[PDB]
Amino acid sequence: SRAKVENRLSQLEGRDLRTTPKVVREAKKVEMTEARAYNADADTAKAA
Amino acid sequence: EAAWIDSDDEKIKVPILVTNKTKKLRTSYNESKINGVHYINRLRSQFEKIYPRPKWVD
Amino acid sequence: KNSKIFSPFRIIGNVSNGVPFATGTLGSTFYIVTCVGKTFQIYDANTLHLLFVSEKETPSSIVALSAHFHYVYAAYENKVGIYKRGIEEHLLELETDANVEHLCIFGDYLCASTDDNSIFIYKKSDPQDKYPSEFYTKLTVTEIQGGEIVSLQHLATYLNKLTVVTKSNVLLFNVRTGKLVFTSNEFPDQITTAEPAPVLDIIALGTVTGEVIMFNMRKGKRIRTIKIPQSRISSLSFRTDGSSHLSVGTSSGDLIFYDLDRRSRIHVLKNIHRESYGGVTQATFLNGQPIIVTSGGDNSLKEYVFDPSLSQGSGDVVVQPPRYLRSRGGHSQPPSYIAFADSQSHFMLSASKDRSLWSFSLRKDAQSQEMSQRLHKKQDGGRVGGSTIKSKFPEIVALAIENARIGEWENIITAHKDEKFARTWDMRNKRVGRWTFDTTDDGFVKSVAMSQCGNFGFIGS
Amino acid sequence: SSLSDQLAQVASNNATVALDRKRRQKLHSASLIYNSKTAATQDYDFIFENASKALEELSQIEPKFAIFSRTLFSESSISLDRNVQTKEEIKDLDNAINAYLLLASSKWYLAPTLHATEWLVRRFQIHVKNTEMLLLSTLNYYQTPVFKRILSIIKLPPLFNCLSNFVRSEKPPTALTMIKLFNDMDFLKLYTSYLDQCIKHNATYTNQLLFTTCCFINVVAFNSNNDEKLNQLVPILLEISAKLLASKSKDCQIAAHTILVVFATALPLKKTIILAAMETILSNLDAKEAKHSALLTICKLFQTLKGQGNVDQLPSKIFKLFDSKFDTVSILTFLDKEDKPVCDKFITSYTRSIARYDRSKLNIILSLLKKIRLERYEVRLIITDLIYLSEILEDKSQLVELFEYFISINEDLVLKCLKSLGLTGXXXXXX
């Protein structure tokens, strides 16, 4: 009978009172950023 | 090492100081005509500066 | 077929058709250039506004699209075309009767590949020319060198080398001399796509069986074999920001992202394009930024963003899911009915066989919307019918709109195929209204009308 | 955007650099042991005097901290600050702190450890800069007051927002709010990186692995309703159980067995995936205490999946791996236990692989059938393979002894399948 009171108490103490807000998933503003690339006209070359 | 060797890539003598994109590939200031094997080695290192080398390829 | 009363303006309501589009860097901004049938369009990246279309339509369908910094290269039936601003600046003719299928441009050497295994090389006459015009040579791939030309790519830091991928092997061509310099070993699968990589001498090959074979072209050996279960691979691209992300796009409407550092998956986007129209035809990252632009045969073009990580310190492990952004689209089907929403010739309502209803705009082509089929709550307090797994309305066959009293109640009555009630739509709110009008004699509706005052709607059983 | 939201981004970046004495007062009052007034009125050397005594006590306990005496707890590590050093060396300072916390996550019930990490809080600002690895290290001690102290010091990352009501709270966080933390999809991947770094540095102990199993089982149980969510949760806990099985310890193997059982019981899987679950369990199993747990896990994993070919023959690679890692006598003595768990689908799949591959030891299935009680369709599939064995094998009389058991009990079943394949009277002629 003490175990069932202890099991009731474990259910009672684990019962939280106030709300737990979950992980906030909000989109941030994403902007175009300047980035580098490769030029193909320097990749070509002319014969001697 | 190398699975192919381009025989017509050594005789070429490209200029470097004629276009502003290639003008960052000079190391001295009295070099303008540089052969292809030095030029394609320089352009490899410049491409390694522009795009980095991630670890999964190695 | 000429007319003395009407003359064609453009084709309102199209974004893409299914051809692999091109994108070109232009300073900091990017332009997404697609083609629609006998013309082609230029879309900006940061707003997806239409910028330029072709001034004069091509005689046939556009097969290959490529774009340098300013000059967009379109490739229709026999000839390739160099365009700027939509204006036909130069027409480059291929002196063969076969059809052009793929079009690569690197340097002064334009690389046009016909369908019958011939690669044409076009040279700039002047080193300061803005596009190649003279004809250099005609490379030929025989039946002993490989299959048909799947794609033409030019890998980085290769001096006058063209990378050709066949259905069975990869070849290299010294285009200044027109000579084969290296052949790859045979690939047992049929290669379907090719893409260069930010790492040097690396090309990514996607096969019809879901294998991504990642071929180091210097050593002539593959490195990473990424397996996808039984899915046809159509698109390949790399996120060039610095984080190791490989985007592989299946033709079954799936987009799979791989973290090459951790050898693990990231996310499998489901149904970003429909199955029957080709799926994810072309999907690539903007160069250096976490925005991927996807397009397919479903007449749509979506943008997805990889958000920065929620963890402040970990970073590379906990990566964010891709998230929907700007998208422009049209009907996947031909449109059945068209009406006009106002006297200003501004808005056009089009109901298609794709079970939808769009409000296009003749004035600004980015003002178009898909009018929402989200049912209003019933006034009685009783739950409405229909399926829990939501599907669209049936195909609309008759339509009527009165623009007199707009926005204070419903002003569109649309009639669907094989339905015993017509449906109301509010044009100002761009949403299905809260009233359905039964025929009350067990009958499909074949005609509907409005009064000019707009208070009364007529229903024909 | 607006102005003040950009300012909080600057304020979160510069929350460790002291500008006024008020900012120094509100940063030095962060204290693991002392109160607020004593923390504000003590110098860096006075903290370091207790710190050098703390790490000397810890070096007596385990000698892995003897490295950290000369890199993080040197007397030269006083004048330097994180906010004066550039980005190429603050990364080296970050993982050195993360290497210390992993090597000191086990040692936390001792007051020498709390004195040692107190100076790391004050001198290197780890309660603001790298708050994640600190909170993951002490997460298994949430009942203890040192976690209530740590929440009262730390600033919470956006991922541990479920503990936002438990900072400066007189009651400790409970069991239910820890599962609500672990129910987040992204936090499971971050704990995967923490666990993979925990296994790779070879410091994994009982208490944090008991707690990690106690939350991994619940997060499958809390997501047992949503089948879409458990599909999204499959590549995390299987990759964890892949890395946990790859560990050579006596503890990670049993902890990987606990994850692999309840996940498959709450979610039936493809046969080839659970076939890979056999080979990863069977590969590095050498602990004596983990051999009994591994046999019950493979027992439970086989009865989870249902379908045609459920009890078919195993591959020869898996069968010879099971023969080496488990003797036939060992699985017979396992069946001798009067608890006798539900091994029915595994045994009939084991003996069909016995009849196919070795084709020599049929005395075991005589002892296997007498020990276990089997269902109807599993007996039919055994007899059908033994009938196929009667066709091809040069029939010794022990095969006749095996069918003598098959006619001793349920003789209509062997007679019916003999009518399906062959003649009833031809059995005596063939055996």
From Swiss-Prot, chain A:
It comes from the Eukaryota. It is found in: Nucleus, Nucleolus. Required for pre-18S rRNA processing. May bind microtubules. Belongs to the NOP5/NOP56 family. Interacts with SIK1/NOP56 and NOP1. Interacts with the trimethylguanosine synthase TGS1. Component of the ribosomal small subunit (SSU) processome composed of at least 40 protein subunits and snoRNA U3. This is Nucleolar protein 58. It comes from Saccharomyces cerevisiae (strain YJM789). The chain holds residues 390 to 437 of 511 of the full protein.
UniProtKB/Swiss-Prot annotation, chain B:
It is found in: Nucleus, Nucleolus. Residues 1-58 are annotated as: Interaction with UTP21. Transmembrane segments: none annotated. It comes from the Eukaryota. Present with 9570 molecules/cell in log phase SD medium. Involved in nucleolar processing of pre-18S ribosomal RNA and ribosome assembly. Interacts with snoRNA U3. Interacts with MPP10, UTP21 and UTP25. Component of the ribosomal small subunit (SSU) processome composed of at least 40 protein subunits and snoRNA U3. Belongs to the WD repeat UTP18 family. This is U3 small nucleolar RNA-associated protein 18. It comes from Saccharomyces cerevisiae (strain ATCC 204508 / S288c) (Baker's yeast). The gene is UTP18.
Swiss-Prot record, chain C:
WD repeats lie at residues 22-53, 63-93, 101-140, 150-183, 190-227, 234-269, 277-329, 336-370, 397-436. It is found in: Nucleus, Nucleolus. It comes from the Eukaryota. The WD repeats are grouped into two tandem seven-bladed beta-propeller regions. Interacts with snoRNA U3. Interacts with MPP10. Interacts (via WD repeats) with UTP18. Component of the ribosomal small subunit (SSU) processome composed of at least 40 protein subunits and snoRNA U3. Present with 2020 molecules/cell in log phase SD medium. Involved in nucleolar processing of pre-18S ribosomal RNA and ribosome assembly. This is U3 small nucleolar RNA-associated protein 21.
